[PDB]
Symmetry: C3
Subunit: 149 residues, 3 copies
């Protein structure tokens, strides 16, 4: 019976969809995702900002964005080394924007930064003690992605 088989296929597909979602939930949890909080993941590879951005988008996430101290601390702990943040002033020098949109609100700049040093620095890294510093987007820094809460 073709219709009986089609209904089974629907049931099979639905079952699969539910299991894949459970697998994603389990993975996030094992990656340290706290309930109702976005989580961060890194492979500890250093690369230019454009590569991090491409990579994270490929994973349906975005370059990590600290929107408060807790998140800043979380990113610092995941990264373990200097890493790019999803913040840049490439569009208009001096005005930092999130890669996903909007002007920067919470910030944790290191003393005397951002300084757009020399020829210029339009990207941002989370460095020592979790403070931030603007740097050339061409530099290679750890890739840390954030995924929705």
């Amino acid at each position: 019976a073709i219709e009986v088989k089609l209904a089974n296929m629907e049931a099979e597909i639905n079952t699969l969809k539910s299991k894949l979602e459970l697998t994603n939930k389990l993975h996030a949890f094992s990656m340290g995702k706290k309930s109702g909080k976005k989580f961060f993941v890194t492979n500890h590879e250093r690369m230019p900002f454009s590569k991090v951005k491409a990579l994270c988008s490929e994973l349906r996430g975005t370059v990590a964005i600290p929107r408060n101290a807790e998140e800043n601390k979380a990113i610092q702990e995941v990264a373990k080394t200097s890493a790019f943040l999803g913040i840049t002033d490439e569009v208009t020098e001096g005005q930092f924007m999130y890669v996903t949109g909007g002007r920067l609100t919470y910030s944790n700049w290191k003393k005397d930064e951002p300084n757009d040093h020399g020829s210029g620095e339009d990207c941002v890294t989370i460095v020592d003690n979790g403070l931030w510093n603007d740097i050339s987007c061409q530099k290679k820094k750890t890739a840390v992605c954030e995924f929705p809460a």
Copy 2:
């Protein structure tokens, strides 16, 4: 056509189901699951027992339960801090029961425990050295979930 197209699709689904199962095995392995041993995992978040029960059930798992010394050690090494166990005497004071049913078969109580201290303590936490202490279910401890061997 229809029947052939349908049969081909059923084959595709079966293949996808196998792939997901492989994804699950590899995830558990990368997370430290030992062959033939239960898989214990945590996000390192502390929360009330009710929250833990909810979280693990949502992942289609259960609150970690040590049935022997080997499992107690395994849970201890996953939690790294104090964590709730799936054991309570909430229903009947003095008689600890697994959240999945049954009376205790193995216990590892710390000296002077269980004491049902003060207003009463119905939940169990695996603390330092792997020893157990009964505490208020409302207190916040690490969430450790258990998955099949």
Copy 3:
């Protein structure tokens, strides 16, 4: 309906395939896979060689094999303790081959190794210093699987 439901199911299956691919990409990333580089994974379990082979095959991978100084270091870092390599001279004493097939293209043998000591040693482990040493395949060493770049 029939044809419409069937065509939709096809799109549903195709959507699921993409999602699972994404899940696999994200999991590899979480496991530390570097772009275009092969990656090694371990659950840190010690078992005999036959078991390692069986387990990695079950994960659709192969027992870790260092093709150069770089990979040799990479494996050593993942394992943390002496692990088996996908190299043995089981077939013909003295002729070490990859479990995947072929003669050695690279090797980092310690002085006077391999020596087929005593009752015999047909397996190889990466010691806690990069060097190789042939050991008994019955010994329990850390299981490290390798997946392609």
